[PDB]
Scaffold this active site. Structure first.
Site, PDB file in Angstrom:
ATOM      1  N   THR A  49      -7.549   9.313  37.118  1.00  0.00           N
ATOM      2  CA  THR A  49      -6.292   9.178  37.842  1.00  0.00           C
ATOM      3  C   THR A  49      -5.116   9.842  37.136  1.00  0.00           C
ATOM      4  O   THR A  49      -4.021   9.888  37.705  1.00  0.00           O
ATOM      5  CB  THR A  49      -5.974   7.697  38.091  1.00  0.00           C
ATOM      6  N   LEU A  50      -5.312  10.361  35.923  1.00  0.00           N
ATOM      7  CA  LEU A  50      -4.255  11.067  35.209  1.00  0.00           C
ATOM      8  C   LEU A  50      -4.860  12.165  34.344  1.00  0.00           C
ATOM      9  O   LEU A  50      -6.059  12.165  34.050  1.00  0.00           O
ATOM     10  CB  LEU A  50      -3.431  10.125  34.320  1.00  0.00           C
ATOM     11  N   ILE A  86      -6.459  14.827  32.069  1.00  0.00           N
ATOM     12  CA  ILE A  86      -7.654  15.668  32.082  1.00  0.00           C
ATOM     13  C   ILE A  86      -8.575  15.273  33.229  1.00  0.00           C
ATOM     14  O   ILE A  86      -9.053  16.127  33.987  1.00  0.00           O
ATOM     15  CB  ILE A  86      -8.379  15.588  30.726  1.00  0.00           C
ATOM     16  N   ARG A 141      -7.453   1.584  35.695  1.00  0.00           N
ATOM     17  CA  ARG A 141      -7.092   0.173  35.591  1.00  0.00           C
ATOM     18  C   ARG A 141      -5.928  -0.229  36.488  1.00  0.00           C
ATOM     19  O   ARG A 141      -5.901  -1.368  36.967  1.00  0.00           O
ATOM     20  CB  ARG A 141      -6.772  -0.182  34.131  1.00  0.00           C
ATOM     21  N   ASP A 171     -12.472  -1.065  34.390  1.00  0.00           N
ATOM     22  CA  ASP A 171     -12.317  -0.804  32.964  1.00  0.00           C
ATOM     23  C   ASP A 171     -13.670  -0.380  32.404  1.00  0.00           C
ATOM     24  O   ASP A 171     -14.652  -1.121  32.527  1.00  0.00           O
ATOM     25  CB  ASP A 171     -11.798  -2.048  32.242  1.00  0.00           C
ATOM     26  N   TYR A 230     -10.637   6.911  15.799  1.00  0.00           N
ATOM     27  CA  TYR A 230     -10.897   7.950  16.791  1.00  0.00           C
ATOM     28  C   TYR A 230     -11.962   8.930  16.305  1.00  0.00           C
ATOM     29  O   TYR A 230     -12.829   9.346  17.082  1.00  0.00           O
ATOM     30  CB  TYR A 230      -9.594   8.679  17.128  1.00  0.00           C
ATOM     31  N   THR A 260      -1.217  16.115  28.153  1.00  0.00           N
ATOM     32  CA  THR A 260      -1.537  15.024  29.064  1.00  0.00           C
ATOM     33  C   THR A 260      -0.501  13.935  28.862  1.00  0.00           C
ATOM     34  O   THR A 260       0.287  13.984  27.912  1.00  0.00           O
ATOM     35  CB  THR A 260      -2.949  14.473  28.796  1.00  0.00           C
ATOM     36  N   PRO A 261      -0.450  12.941  29.759  1.00  0.00           N
ATOM     37  CA  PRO A 261       0.475  11.819  29.521  1.00  0.00           C
ATOM     38  C   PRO A 261       0.253  11.102  28.196  1.00  0.00           C
ATOM     39  O   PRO A 261       1.232  10.701  27.555  1.00  0.00           O
ATOM     40  CB  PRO A 261       0.207  10.896  30.717  1.00  0.00           C
ATOM     41  N   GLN A 277     -11.057  28.012  12.148  1.00  0.00           N
ATOM     42  CA  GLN A 277     -10.513  28.256  10.817  1.00  0.00           C
ATOM     43  C   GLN A 277     -10.646  27.023   9.929  1.00  0.00           C
ATOM     44  O   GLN A 277     -10.838  25.908  10.416  1.00  0.00           O
ATOM     45  CB  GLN A 277      -9.045  28.688  10.905  1.00  0.00           C
TER      46      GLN A 277
HETATM   47 MG   LIG Z   1     -11.163  23.931   9.724  1.00  0.00          MG
END
Ligand SMILES: [Mg+2]
Ligand SMILES: [Mg+2]
Ligand SMILES: [Mg+2]
Ligand SMILES: [Mg+2]
Ligand SMILES: [Mg+2]
Ligand SMILES: [Mg+2]
Lengths: 251, 251, 251, 251, 251, 251, 251, 251
Positions: A15-16, A18, A38, A62, A155, A192-193, A251
């Site tokens: 819904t947003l 990507i 959600r 969700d 992450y 993105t948002p 790189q």
């Molecule tokens: Mg590198």
């Protein structure tokens, strides 16, 4: 055009940003789509802005809810017929180093970025195998599944788990002749948002020391590579990683 | 010899197999060691068989217990002085494909293989930084953090998360001048008690199509590479991956 | 100590920089060494500065000379007995992009950095196999065998070829039970005389955006990792890449 | 359709196998093409079989001929206008281990597989930069640029050099705002005439231990991924590797 | 009126139904209030409809988020001064018997109804003790904490845990002279938005066999009993249960 | 204030202790009150000390006198209008175990504590029903209606009967729509004249093993809970027990 | 069997219904019993139907007769030896609400259901204490000692008094080491002759809204729980309530 | 004896303390039993010490492992036939107040004391319903499910959830005619190995202010009450609570 003729796709978090761009191009190429989110007012407005109810619809869910995955597939099958394509896109981020990550932060991010992708990948294989659909599961990882970032601890672990778990899924469905392909997509920094949520990150990641092109990407850059992986042009591609990052990892 | 002069090391799961070999060679090279495990009779017998209480001791602790990590570091500091080296070795495996993995299996394996390594890596940085110790955190991943296996679904995700999370930790302590290094070790198939748990896996993984050397490794093969990473010979190595697999990933 | 007991090693380009450090540590650990170079006065002084003629000697040889490779092995075998270890270390660099690289520059760099390593690896396998020596061939690649640099065009190509060619050799000697291992070492930026070819590289590569530790390495950092690979501690390691770069490739 | 609107493409070795399929799909998507080869009778028949002279033509040229590269660009520019796309596709293979590779074999393969790609990449950057064409250079590597094979010694080295040299070119054209992208494609085993050089390779590489899908690919599998990289859909992709191998490198 | 003179109150889930009524009457009696919820547009509209920003404000927070509890108390303290009153009201329900409850349903309900109440009760004691505020923690349980319902399995466990956990908290703060009281409130069936979620439950629970009064209650019925427990009129009440159910539990 | 607007209340035993406090707060909140007792000189002084004859008056009556109950309601109705509220408060205690209780002691205590409450509850229902008064009968039980005491044999039995008899009355008036509510109040130990009957009870019940707050209550603690039950704020509360005991029954 | 070895028991009202079943099972388990009742012809027939005069006998006695209690204990002691067990079982019921209960009805029911149980409990403690008998007094209450019924006014009060008075006796004999335990049993609806006093009660209380099992119990259901409480298996149980009601009080 | 004729019972945590006593008496009364535990040497020794393999066996299982519950029932059915009785006994304790409880402590205790009991109760109903077995589920709560303790925060919540969840289960199987009964057992302080874990708790809880009998109980005291609830003597008992605490909760 009509590179996705006759396909039925679920796109989590479509819904947003990507996911919304992926949904737009999928419909443009002949697919029938179900986007999830959600917030229901944003979600219904997003579906209507892309097309008619016989082209795309919305389903509040969700990705970390295990019970919802079964209802999501049943609803999509009822509206459009058997599902042939899954895009595991929904994810969140936390701006913390490994040293300064609370256990609460750790558990909540992995509940969405890892547990959710596992829930969909596992049920997708069961529902789409052995049906001649030319099935394709596309799991959204990141460049943070290749290199590390000092303030993206949880992450980094999230996207690294996704990277290698999909290889195991791809091999199992190829050795067993399931007619299901699994691949991962690794975007660079995209406007993105949620990237506006991390203040000043756009200017920092547009330096040449980070992104050699001197700028970041747009949501359509990720949409086009997923049309390839969802279509039958990629029928020999499984268990591979596709990077679109403007040179970040070169790189 | 005495390549690990004056070092203080914690080794999780060091009472059997790979960890027990790491502990043996660490003591042989001058380190003072604290091995952990869940069974106390096996653990105490293991510590005494390697050396005297002023060389090595045992501490009963489940790596997935968050509260125990603080008591583990306090005990080791009380017996030997400030800790300088951490080996995140304890882990478990499940023989299931992604399609056939129960949610219970998924959560229990990641609680040890991922949450536990995060608990130790996070607290290790806090306790060892900025003390001139030449600190080193060694996280045990696997070749299953590079390639997938069709019947090691949760394990593949486990080791992939470890692979990329350690890169983020290594960068944070290098940019901040913490005097802490983080690296990952990726063993091939090694004859340990837990490999006898998967029946006939030794003969299957000794085929040339899998391990080109026609045989699998021994626990000392992993012990020697971790002496290098724990000693000051590796003072320029951080955020890197070290593979010892008999050629598995080369083909 | 004596981790290289009874070993006989050839080190190409062992009269300066990294190779001289490898030679120094090899002798300290019990090996007998023959270093090569193009200038004989510097080479003889280099050998004498490390030890006595029964520990180390010098042999004038250009790595790109194919016929000289046979005389190099004959000379070393005559002085010390059968050779068991080879380090393909000699190499050069040019500060040019692909767009502005002359064909002359291109040919000369690959003649040394690629043809020379191929000449030694090919004859090393023939001479050291099937003799119970625990043989080990160590090919010097770089981080430039992993990532690209906009002004190291020909150097990038050379070092990428070495990375993958050694995997092929390693597999062949393992499947055929040759008792020869092949592995590659990938250093970051190290302070050597060869840095005069890349003007200003020390200050440029010591920025945190390049090497996270804020400094570059010293030749001994590479010597220690080659002691491990030359000794029998690494008897299960073949076809692998070992990176010592101060965090360079982790971001 | 017309995903390659207004593009002008050179495809080396486009008279058989993979290149002929790339040429076929390029014309179908709106591009005008010039294919090259060494035998002119086969080449002229190949061009005519794909389309009319205002869509595709043939130019006799050996990829290792340095002077011919300038005439190739001049001829293509004269027929169709300024060139915007280059596919360095021509290559050959030899079934030899490193130990048993003759120097003659070594030199001839690298002259085509490496020198030729360098000749085209170098002149492609010079001729296509700074003209608003949305230029794209696609260098054909292989899975043998990722993993080794015991009987593909020289081929492994060639393809590894291509993998890392293209990263260097990609970075240079992004940091300098050249409007040129460079990317590599890594096919698995594909049924082409070139398989007669590796005797028995189809049956050998169709075992599940090699290609998990139980079969090898067809030339169109590689054509579709090169349509994406040649079109403006990939305007954010540079310096990346795209693998289409049926799961080969995932295990 | 002004029975709550000078008090500062946090009310979780105070933007609808029972909590919204509690907030309204609290402001009417002199308290300064901070209501929480997950939807921000509904939440801000709810706060403004009750009073001015110096009387009541809104804070977006999921009660199951452990990290948010610290930010919630800091925000309320910054706007109104030290917090003196906490109402743990946010909760959810599932219409399943114990036999037919999925593990996902079980974990999600207890994450809010039990873990959330524990997070607030634990931090409330720390922040409000030993400050002469006349502190009061009011935990919302239910009649389902006294009797069972065959299709409220997880809910019965939720409210039973709350019932006895608060007794332990009340005793600890009384024996230690913390100036903090803890009590539980047990409503019967009340017409709220979430009761319209269970279709036809209102008519079923208004039968005399269930509620002897022949009707269900209104949100103000629960608001008034919590004004008593928050004011200093109840300074001798701690660890007790207060039932307002129209006779449900009397038969 | 004026939470008891327009109400007319009878309070038995309202000339001392708890009842006098209930009477005081009732008048302060707008009710008109008639207190009863056995000694008339104390009673008249008590009424005058609270307010003027148009606010509160006294009526000499023994709670165990059945015929007097009718005259009590007639007198109160004549002075103030129809009665809407009844508090059955008069009671006495004896410090005896069951084993050593005389039959005379047993009969006299139950005549007041049980027969008297029954006489008032029975006639209260008859006189107050079906008149739109919002009627409320409040029966004074104790914590000794919940737990036992080894030296309060007859008192325990009295107060347990009151606890369950009031539930029966409450159900009857709710099922029949009588507009009458019945509830019980259970005080802990309160400092009143009646404590002279239990010698040393203040010091004994102020130990932390007995009352966790370390002290006993005051009559106003019970007055406030009876204002709630007498007002229309409790219109949904019937057949319930309200405990104000300083934590006594929580352990 | 012989779970009541050597015990001597008095059972009031043991000539019908529940008591007769308790007497039957007591004799079967080794006890010697004396049952009481008001009609002597039924009583003598009841005793003879259970066993021989050396196992069980009858004694005509009204439970409300205070002087008869001493003769009852004397007679039982003379026939069987010292009494060790007392079951206060005799009771009656009246189908009246509190509003419509006559004072005559009120007095007669409490004389039997409350005064009688008090007479036996008081003398039981005196006669059975401090003799090593493992004494046990079992007082028969009801579910109507827990919840109210709109048409069981006086019965509710009786049974509530028994519930809490027995707790007081139990505490006194435990604190003083009397070797006497006191506990209460709370049956649901049981098919006995006494149900003729509540007309239509079997069909009314067999609805699922009343007894969840859809039926009422039989006298043996209460006999078995009294065997446990009379035997030494319950030597740690005192002052507790045991409910056997088919689920009645759980909803 | 043989009060449990023909029954098949699972007892979680039956290798020590209370559970071991329950298992002993169950076998003595005719049942066939399967005890569970985490340590296998202790568990097998416990089973053999009670009886022969056709009377009782051991099964290694952690009650918090959801997958193990299915294997536990299958094993017991294979050895003894269909299971008729379940005793949810395994539990643990933490000595912390609510204020000082870590989130780790909170989650680990509830994983065993609440999640485990739910796993067994849920699967027990499915496997034992509608089979004429006279099924009985006995859930082990505590006196800490009735009253609170200031330093047993998580434990109080644990046992309170168990108390009310079992009522819901009991009602569902009675309304649906499942032939399954559910009841809870509430022990006082009993001398077990885990009570020696809390130092000096035995002497503290043997004071008369805590346990009126001046001493604590033994494991057999809990064993006998569970024989009653497992046998058909209790066929009218469901949804009730049985307390054996030496008077703890009576004062
Ligand atoms: Mg590198
Ligand atoms: Mg997790
Ligand atoms: Mg492989
Ligand atoms: Mg108590
Ligand atoms: Mg009820
Ligand atoms: Mg939980």
């Amino acid at each position: 055009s009509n590179r996705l003729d006759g396909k039925v796709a679920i796109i989590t978090g479509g819904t947003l940003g990507i996911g919304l761009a992926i949904a737009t191009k999928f419909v443009e190429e002949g697919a029938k789509v179900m986007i999830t989110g959600r917030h229901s007012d944003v979600g219904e407005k997003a579906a209507k802005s892309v097309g008619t109810p016989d082209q795309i619809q919305f389903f509040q869910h969700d990705s970390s809810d295990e019970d919802g995955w079964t209802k999501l597939f049943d609803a999509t099958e009822k509206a459009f017929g058997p599902v042939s394509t899954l895009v595991n896109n929904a994810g969140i981020a936390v701006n913390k180093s490994v040293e300064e990550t609370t256990t609460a932060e750790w558990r909540k991010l992995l509940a969405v970025n890892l547990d959710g992708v596992f829930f969909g990948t596992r049920l997708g294989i069961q529902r789409m195998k052995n049906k001649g659909l030319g099935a394709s599961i596309i799991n959204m990882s990141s460049i943070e599944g290749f290199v590390g970032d000092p303030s993206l601890g949880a992450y980094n672990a999230s996207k690294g788990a996704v990277r290698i778990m999909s290889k195991s899924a791809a091999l199992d469905c190829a050795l067993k002749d399931y007619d299901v392909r699994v691949n991962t997509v690794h975007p660079g920094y995209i406007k993105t948002p949620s990237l506006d949520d991390l203040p000043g990150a756009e200017e920092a990641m547009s330096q040449r020391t980070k992104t050699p092109m001197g700028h970041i990407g747009e949501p359509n850059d990720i949409a086009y590579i997923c049309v390839y992986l969802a279509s039958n042009e990629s029928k020999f591609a499984t268990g591979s990683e596709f990077v679109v990052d403007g040179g970040y990892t070169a790189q």
